[model samples]
Target: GSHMEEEMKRLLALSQEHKFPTVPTKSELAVEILEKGQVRFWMQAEKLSSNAKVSYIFNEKEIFEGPKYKMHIDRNTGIIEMFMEKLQDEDEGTYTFQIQDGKATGHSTLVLIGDVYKKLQKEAEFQRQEWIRKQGPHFAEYLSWEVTGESNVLLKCKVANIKKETHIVWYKDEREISVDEKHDFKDGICTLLITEFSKKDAGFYEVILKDDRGKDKSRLKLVDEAFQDLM
Candidate 1:
């Protein structure tokens, strides 16, 4: 009812150089309904003079008329509608509407897609990349700590997706590890060394990295006597 009236008004205002048929803009709704029972699309334009003509082209081929493909031109509404009885793989492609209204001639094109899931995959991949781009850095090396031969326990973890502004902070249990020979950050790597690997040094070790956009942490557990007699 009212749905076609807006289109009718747009189609009825045609100038000498402006008179042309136009299809609906590309939309996912068109792709969603591709496999539905009947596929319908339309273009509209006003008549330029008493004598006017219209032609339908599918993928550059002319369609004079068809039983499976139906075409109708309504002079009362200046709308040309096309109906396809069934969807086929070949049904998707460029569709064009051309009009010869007195002296002004023009045409518009619409493209149909065959694979909805393929386009969906493309969009989903793009969104994943965008999500990762906005996320924080993650730990790279798993088994992030080791007991050295020199009786020193070294806690280390690598940071992936590091930025220039990333700040690395280390912790021993609830206490913040101070920067010294025991702790340092270099080349996206964080290290904490416990001299003499004593029973007191066996506890929780954690490293946290943060930047302007994101932040992440990695943890390691140390047990008693694990480094004993390891010359």
Candidate 2:
């Protein structure tokens, strides 16, 4: 049985006043599925209006039962814009749209085409190789500390798998400090102990590991009230 043919006709008449085109009996629009998850379609209509209601039907069904998607339409000019969350090979299907006002109605179809998965895989591989080339041979590490009120703060740095004869140095703003008094060196680890932390000590600290070949430096920052007891 036909559903509301009289209502469709009445709606089509209202659509005609707003310049709505005749409802297409067959699908007409063609869409491209880009690798970056983009779907593009172009629509042509003679008498399009801003107040027209637009809806998409998939695989001859007038209702959508899949994931949520977003639709964008130009208010100034009647244009259809839509995007889906993610695209897969199974998403290839026929999409139809019904645009109607109280007086008239128009329809169109979009055929989604392309091999999205293969193109995306090739692009992903290229990006992975490019990232590997940008990384250098050096390894980077970081350390940080916080001081609150007049509390005491101790920072320790150690090198792994090295001989005991190696020298470790601690520096405050690039100036070397006495190792025996405020700084302590034992085994492969270097320690810096600050007694009664003050506002002047809230700054950056550096630990420099040196040998005959080269030197590597690690830096940290001390902020006010950073080490306060949470209890």
Candidate 3:
């Protein structure tokens, strides 16, 4: 009764339910560049008129106009076009067409190749993480203690708004350390108890606290007892 195609179909359907409505329904926008450095953008939107005020925004800022930028509007054809005599590598980015007279606005991003597209993807991710960090739970008390008498160490951090379903993942030197008996998260306090601490256990340790909002991390350095005074 179970098949991979069925599961994949369910996944595809699930993804279709979550779509980002970043642009209006009646607006269509695109950017095209010729090999001879001719840059052009065409926008088709309802309610556009010959007298409609238009502005081009590049990469979220910087009004798109200079020595080489030009525009033409054809209200009869329902198309607004902007052209440029020059195209540079730095010109590759999101382009926005905003019409003041009409309620039409559209956005289009350029992806010339792998590196350019990768940069855009990473920048978008950076924006998302920055937003998440603003409203997400953070470590209120993050520190570590070494108990030499018991030859054990305790790495602890506190989250003020921890939930029972909150997930905690520990890492040592950037490698994941699976949750076990040594890990504890009670109330809002999270800890990793390493008994018989040794050289192998000495490194940078981190705890990733994740919940419905987003994820954040707290880090601490675990150093050898002999080198504790080096700092």
Candidate 4:
């Protein structure tokens, strides 16, 4: 035990001046795991000495001391991989790493989350926001259309919502509309040319949004005598 302590001290003496490397951001520092699954996470201080002494702690308890747990950890690289055969629902916690270069110690932690679905959703929302920041507004735009029997009706839909790229799946009432020459879609916006309007076309229209997110809709109508007589 004393030899191990002295070895630890000897390693710490190699990088005494380097402060804690750098703290990771909230999203980058979190770990999500599923029951009976494996998780590997790493952390490093900004100015790590490349051979500084490092140690890992989970829920305030040291780990990887022996082969007591299904865990592999590297003290030199600040990386840890754990195979939780069947993680209990109650013991989810944080993984902390301590980097010691003599007196200057840098620390980082990863908040363990067992609810991977929720974390996945959180990640999706962040990615959605990032997509919005890049694509601007009007990503998902549903437009209403009015036409007469003589001319083509151009139905349009724009997608500037959480979804970025998508395929066109036009719907009438709740049924999927068949794709044909009359339809044209690209990116987040598309135009459907109804060459000749009919009462069947004057119903609820929508497009399938990915991720089961929901559908965007618009009402189609005719600007003709039949519509005027009703009004």
Best by TM-score: 4
lDDT of 3: 0.57
lDDT of 1 by residue, 1-231 (tens): 858987767676543354233433211112112323245666555663554666677778877667756777666536566676544646465566666666766666555546543453354353334333323244343336666776666766666655555446677666787674324335556666766555666676766656664555556676635647544
Predicted structure 4: lDDT: 0.51
Model 4 per-residue lDDT tens digits across residues 109-223: 7655466434644544533344333224444455555453445566676555454446445777666767652244355566776665456555556655553444444444333
lDDT of 2 by residue, 35-125 (tens): 3435544354333455556667866777543454456656434555666544453656556787664456767765543454445445445
**Compared with the true structure, what per-residue lDDT tens digits does model 3 show for residues 1-231?**
566898888999888763232355334454445333345666654455555556677666647555655777666545676776544547464566665445544454433333554543444453334443344444443556665555556666555655546455668767886665324435456666666455666677776756675666767677755454342
* lDDT minimum window of 10 residues, candidate 1: 25-34
How many clashes in candidate 2?
A: 12
In candidate 3, the residue pairs with backbone N, CA or C atoms under 3 Å apart (3 or more residues apart, or in different chains) clash, namely none
List per-prediction Cα lDDT, in the order shown. Answer: 0.56, 0.54, 0.57, 0.51
Query: What are the models' TM-scores?
Result: 0.35, 0.33, 0.34, 0.38
Candidate number that wins on TM-score, 1 or 2 = 1
Could you tell me the TM-score of candidate 3?
Answer: 0.34
Q: Stretches of candidate 4 above 4 Å error?
A: 1-44, 64-90, 101-103, 108-153, 158-167, 182-189, 193-204, 208-231
Model 1 residue runs over 4 Å out of place are 1-143, 180-185, 224-226, 229-231
Residue 19 deviation, candidate 2, in Å? 54
Instruction: Supply candidate 4's per-residue lDDT for 137.
Output: 42
